[PDB]
Enzyme design. Structure first.
Site, PDB file in Angstrom:
ATOM      1  N   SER B  33       0.783  -1.240   0.000  1.00  0.00           N
ATOM      2  CA  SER B  33       0.000   0.000   0.000  1.00  0.00           C
ATOM      3  C   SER B  33       0.824   1.306   0.000  1.00  0.00           C
ATOM      4  O   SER B  33       1.793   1.439  -0.757  1.00  0.00           O
ATOM      5  CB  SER B  33      -1.004  -0.020   1.164  1.00  0.00           C
ATOM      6  OG  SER B  33      -0.364  -0.077   2.432  1.00  0.00           O
ATOM      7  N   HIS B  64       7.596   0.596  -9.797  1.00  0.00           N
ATOM      8  CA  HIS B  64       8.963   0.586  -9.272  1.00  0.00           C
ATOM      9  C   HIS B  64       9.512  -0.826  -9.118  1.00  0.00           C
ATOM     10  O   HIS B  64       8.766  -1.769  -8.851  1.00  0.00           O
ATOM     11  CB  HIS B  64       9.033   1.304  -7.915  1.00  0.00           C
ATOM     12  CG  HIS B  64       8.377   0.554  -6.794  1.00  0.00           C
ATOM     13  ND1 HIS B  64       9.055  -0.356  -6.008  1.00  0.00           N
ATOM     14  CD2 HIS B  64       7.105   0.579  -6.326  1.00  0.00           C
ATOM     15  CE1 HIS B  64       8.230  -0.859  -5.108  1.00  0.00           C
ATOM     16  NE2 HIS B  64       7.040  -0.309  -5.280  1.00  0.00           N
ATOM     17  N   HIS B  86       3.895 -12.283  -5.894  1.00  0.00           N
ATOM     18  CA  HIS B  86       2.530 -12.785  -5.770  1.00  0.00           C
ATOM     19  C   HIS B  86       2.379 -14.024  -6.633  1.00  0.00           C
ATOM     20  O   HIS B  86       2.957 -14.097  -7.719  1.00  0.00           O
ATOM     21  CB  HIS B  86       1.533 -11.726  -6.237  1.00  0.00           C
ATOM     22  CG  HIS B  86       1.630 -10.427  -5.494  1.00  0.00           C
ATOM     23  ND1 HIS B  86       2.468  -9.403  -5.887  1.00  0.00           N
ATOM     24  CD2 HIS B  86       0.981  -9.980  -4.394  1.00  0.00           C
ATOM     25  CE1 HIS B  86       2.330  -8.382  -5.061  1.00  0.00           C
ATOM     26  NE2 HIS B  86       1.434  -8.707  -4.145  1.00  0.00           N
ATOM     27  N   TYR B  88      -0.069 -14.866  -8.386  1.00  0.00           N
ATOM     28  CA  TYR B  88      -0.736 -14.527  -9.633  1.00  0.00           C
ATOM     29  C   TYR B  88       0.223 -14.085 -10.744  1.00  0.00           C
ATOM     30  O   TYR B  88      -0.185 -13.925 -11.894  1.00  0.00           O
ATOM     31  CB  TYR B  88      -1.853 -13.490  -9.405  1.00  0.00           C
ATOM     32  CG  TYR B  88      -1.407 -12.107  -8.954  1.00  0.00           C
ATOM     33  CD1 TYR B  88      -0.614 -11.301  -9.771  1.00  0.00           C
ATOM     34  CD2 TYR B  88      -1.802 -11.598  -7.718  1.00  0.00           C
ATOM     35  CE1 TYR B  88      -0.227 -10.029  -9.380  1.00  0.00           C
ATOM     36  CE2 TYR B  88      -1.418 -10.318  -7.316  1.00  0.00           C
ATOM     37  CZ  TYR B  88      -0.630  -9.545  -8.153  1.00  0.00           C
ATOM     38  OH  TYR B  88      -0.213  -8.304  -7.752  1.00  0.00           O
ATOM     39  N   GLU B  89       1.487 -13.864 -10.396  1.00  0.00           N
ATOM     40  CA  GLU B  89       2.492 -13.462 -11.378  1.00  0.00           C
ATOM     41  C   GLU B  89       3.159 -14.720 -11.929  1.00  0.00           C
ATOM     42  O   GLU B  89       3.942 -14.658 -12.874  1.00  0.00           O
ATOM     43  CB  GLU B  89       3.545 -12.554 -10.736  1.00  0.00           C
ATOM     44  CG  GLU B  89       2.997 -11.247 -10.183  1.00  0.00           C
ATOM     45  CD  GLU B  89       4.008 -10.485  -9.331  1.00  0.00           C
ATOM     46  OE1 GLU B  89       4.707 -11.116  -8.508  1.00  0.00           O
ATOM     47  OE2 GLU B  89       4.092  -9.244  -9.472  1.00  0.00           O
ATOM     48  N   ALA B 116      -2.709  -4.137   0.892  1.00  0.00           N
ATOM     49  CA  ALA B 116      -3.878  -3.365   0.494  1.00  0.00           C
ATOM     50  C   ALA B 116      -4.961  -4.430   0.447  1.00  0.00           C
ATOM     51  O   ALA B 116      -4.686  -5.557   0.044  1.00  0.00           O
ATOM     52  CB  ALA B 116      -3.674  -2.755  -0.891  1.00  0.00           C
ATOM     53  N   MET B 219      -4.672 -10.604  -2.049  1.00  0.00           N
ATOM     54  CA  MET B 219      -3.958 -11.621  -2.830  1.00  0.00           C
ATOM     55  C   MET B 219      -2.521 -11.883  -2.355  1.00  0.00           C
ATOM     56  O   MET B 219      -1.669 -12.303  -3.142  1.00  0.00           O
ATOM     57  CB  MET B 219      -3.926 -11.191  -4.304  1.00  0.00           C
ATOM     58  CG  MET B 219      -5.293 -10.819  -4.888  1.00  0.00           C
ATOM     59  SD  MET B 219      -5.171 -10.033  -6.504  1.00  0.00           S
ATOM     60  CE  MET B 219      -6.872  -9.535  -6.778  1.00  0.00           C
ATOM     61  N   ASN B 243     -10.544  -0.003  -0.764  1.00  0.00           N
ATOM     62  CA  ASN B 243     -11.832   0.114  -1.430  1.00  0.00           C
ATOM     63  C   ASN B 243     -12.857  -0.772  -0.756  1.00  0.00           C
ATOM     64  O   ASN B 243     -12.508  -1.694  -0.029  1.00  0.00           O
ATOM     65  CB  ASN B 243     -11.713  -0.295  -2.907  1.00  0.00           C
ATOM     66  CG  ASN B 243     -11.164  -1.706  -3.088  1.00  0.00           C
ATOM     67  OD1 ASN B 243      -9.972  -1.946  -2.899  1.00  0.00           O
ATOM     68  ND2 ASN B 243     -12.027  -2.639  -3.456  1.00  0.00           N
ATOM     69  N   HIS B 257      -7.918  -0.896 -10.132  1.00  0.00           N
ATOM     70  CA  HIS B 257      -6.572  -0.760  -9.601  1.00  0.00           C
ATOM     71  C   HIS B 257      -6.202   0.697  -9.351  1.00  0.00           C
ATOM     72  O   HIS B 257      -5.399   0.991  -8.465  1.00  0.00           O
ATOM     73  CB  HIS B 257      -5.567  -1.402 -10.559  1.00  0.00           C
ATOM     74  CG  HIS B 257      -4.177  -1.487 -10.012  1.00  0.00           C
ATOM     75  ND1 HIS B 257      -3.898  -2.002  -8.763  1.00  0.00           N
ATOM     76  CD2 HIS B 257      -2.984  -1.126 -10.544  1.00  0.00           C
ATOM     77  CE1 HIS B 257      -2.596  -1.953  -8.548  1.00  0.00           C
ATOM     78  NE2 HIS B 257      -2.019  -1.426  -9.613  1.00  0.00           N
TER      79      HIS B 257
HETATM   80  O1  HPA Z   1     -11.262  -5.610  -3.757  1.00  0.00           O
HETATM   81  C1  HPA Z   1     -10.195  -6.216  -3.650  1.00  0.00           C
HETATM   82  N1  HPA Z   1     -10.165  -7.573  -3.849  1.00  0.00           N
HETATM   83  C2  HPA Z   1      -9.067  -8.377  -3.770  1.00  0.00           C
HETATM   84  N2  HPA Z   1      -7.857  -7.904  -3.480  1.00  0.00           N
HETATM   85  C3  HPA Z   1      -7.849  -6.560  -3.271  1.00  0.00           C
HETATM   86  N3  HPA Z   1      -6.731  -5.815  -2.947  1.00  0.00           N
HETATM   87  C4  HPA Z   1      -7.159  -4.507  -2.831  1.00  0.00           C
HETATM   88  N4  HPA Z   1      -8.501  -4.421  -3.065  1.00  0.00           N
HETATM   89  C5  HPA Z   1      -8.919  -5.708  -3.336  1.00  0.00           C
END
Ligand code: HPA
Ligand code: HPA
Ligand code: HPA
Lengths: 282, 282, 282
Positions: B33, B64, B86, B88-89, B116, B219, B243, B257
């Site tokens: 974050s 970065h 991560h 997912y990468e 985050a 994630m 969010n 994002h």
């Molecule tokens: O809404 C979200 N979902 C999943 N991962 C996240 N990381 C930040 N916001 C989110």
């Protein structure tokens, strides 16, 4: 991914066992918990170390190597797995379940599976024995399944049903037998949920597992039942509740491998006589 | 699957860092974050690009590259990961968690993780900071675990407990510190749930996640906490609610994002001073 | 893991198709259930076996090989997949979803997905057609995702939203069209949940799936919708409820592949005319 074993691999291993023992088992038992000492009650026993049997996955167990023991238990010819394989050790499900298909090729018709499990159901106590009535397969939800890949028609169908995996008649026999043992505690029965491990669950994970309807949690057995049902083996299994899971944030303590071992040690006596008595009813 | 790194790989990397800096950190921080700017508050800082450190997984972060920064923050010697890995990468969990074990070998005793997250708890607002009290590991349910494979006894035990992963005392210190900052908003605390990504959840997925008891969704982080607890690192972490998730079918809009980035930008000031203040209490 | 196909692989396959047919489809349809006979209603049809198209995953379907059929249906130029790929056959998600990205490169703008599903919602009856309003992606929770690995910017963004995956306007058109058909049964609408298979669920698994909010259960479609939305394809899909799942321990019987086939056979007539009518409204 797909199964790394061809049908021939299974039959080669089966033919090897047949030519090395005169024993011809009808029942196969995968020991867990305090059932490890069950081998000591076999007659005309013959032991094979997993490492000397071609194609067999290499491994061991807690404090002892993995051995395949043939013998007669309470008048029934059977083969037992002293130590099993777990995905958390690195094994893909097609290696974990290798023995189940070989048992089928040896003429085995019944499979008895046992394990150690953490109790999720509030009414369970350490030492309780729970007949597995149904299971929840979490790894399955993601595709981690021993049947993933091309289907081997010589074992079974592409889409096998699992709603009748745990034999009804056998569970009935188990209740009658438990009554004849004069046990003061009731024979439990419920849903077993499997996850990968090797770490123990968190409070939040235990709460959701219970809300999902599971009664006991463990890291094995399910892949074996899937494959066994796929090839038409009658399945019966039970869990030794080795500990009550921490469902409270005010953690008094925490699940430890030591305690599950102690439980396995203290219940061995009744686990063995229970399985022994059941042999006559199969 | 198993860990592709031998114990020696970890110590080689650790020995390399030690011979290239005089810094000897006790705390390790994995920034997420708006904590990205935290490196700017370090004294006697020394930066290492991930690509120049042997065995370190190659990567970067949003806008970065990934850098390992050593330095003194508010009187405490620490090392920070500016950018993480991560699944997912494409990274398997044993690559994702590589840094955690190296930190252990450097003498680090405390790990601070931040991220985050999307808010699932209705009482959360964008900008809220939630102390991670517990976690739910979905990938773990399927076997996707950084500890899968043979256990390295030199790091920890085969079956580590996770019910006490998030240090109790540290969470208490966090509440006291937040009070001293005179913040008008309350410091949240809850359960973090991890899923694979990279796509954002659907309404139906968010509803079940909330019903499962999760307060925030993300994630990352969980694999790191697992490995850290396995090797005996004291862990403390928090999520920046970037969010509020769309829980309504009448989607007014949708998670993007961009917005999570803006949130990270607007809360940076307080995230940094919060972590800075906590250093004194570790 | 990452996608084994480079962007060029997709365009090579697309260029090959373009140079072998004069057809230029705007709609792509992935047939399932009784929609298999839909190819018989195409005009100026041109068929390609999956095995003759470079880079295309090799496979077939139940009782028939996989073919890609180009043609005009009710005045609309489209391409249809007669037979799809499933992870339970061994295919990773990046192979399963290969066709979706090629369709995009051919100029396709709309994707229609259909499947067979087991009914979880008590109000559903065999033969019912359910518009997919939303989905739950279990394999996704563990990281099994077609987008795992480096993101191909030429297809879409790193973190795509899924809360609006099923086109709202199309679902509205579907309801109007169903009314014009004079059908006595109501057009259902709900949440589809995907799991890996190939075995059918147990009673306990079905109960939790329903509690999680799912209306129908299946072993496909979701990976395709993910990838399609990632590259900006408008998506619309529906499930043919081929059977009601055993939710009762007193199993009267059990889900069988035969019955799902019969259902697919009996509903084909209306499935085809429904999709045909919808073509005009796209
Ligand atoms: O809404 C979200 N979902 C999943 N991962 C996240 N990381 C930040 N916001 C989110
Ligand atoms: O608490 C437990 N959790 C998971 N598996 C177990 N196997 C024995 N006890 C447990
Ligand atoms: O009962 C079912 N379960 C899972 N997938 C299915 N596909 C058709 N019927 C079913």
């Amino acid at each position: 991914m797909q199964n790394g074993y061809t049908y021939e691999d299974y039959q080669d291993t089966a033919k090897w066992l047949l030519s090395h023992t005169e024993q011809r088992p009808q029942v196969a038992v995968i020991c867990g918990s305090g059932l490890g000492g069950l081998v000591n009650k076999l007659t005309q026993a013959q032991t094979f170390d997993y490492s000397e049997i071609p194609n067999f996955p290499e491994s061991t167990v807690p404090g002892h190597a993995g051995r395949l023991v043939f013998g007669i238990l309470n008048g029934r010819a059977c083969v037992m797995m002293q130590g099993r394989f777990h995905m958390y050790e690195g094994y893909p499900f097609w290696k974990v379940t290798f023995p189940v298909r070989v048992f089928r090729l040896l003429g085995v018709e019944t499979l008895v599976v046992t394990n150690a499990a953490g109790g999720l159901n509030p009414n369970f106590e350490v030492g309780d024995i729970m007949l597995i009535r149904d299971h929840i397969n979490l790894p399955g939800f993601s595709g981690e399944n021993p049947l993933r890949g091309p289907n081997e028609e010589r074992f079974g169908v592409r889409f096998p049903a699992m709603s009748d995996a745990y034999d009804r008649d056998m569970r009935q026999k188990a209740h009658s037998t438990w009554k004849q043992m004069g046990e003061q505690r009731e024979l439990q029965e419920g849903t077993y949920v499997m996850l990968g491990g090797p770490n123990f669950e968190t409070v939040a994970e235990c709460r959701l597992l219970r809300n999902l309807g599971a009664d006991a949690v463990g890291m094995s057995t399910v892949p074996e039942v899937i494959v066994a049902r796929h090839c038409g083996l009658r399945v019966f299994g039970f869990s030794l509740i080795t500990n009550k899971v921490i469902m409270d944030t005010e953690s008094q303590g925490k699940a430890n491998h030591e305690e599950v071992l102690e439980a396995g040690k203290q219940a061995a006596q009744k686990l063995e006589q229970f399985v022994s008595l059941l042999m006559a009813s199969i």
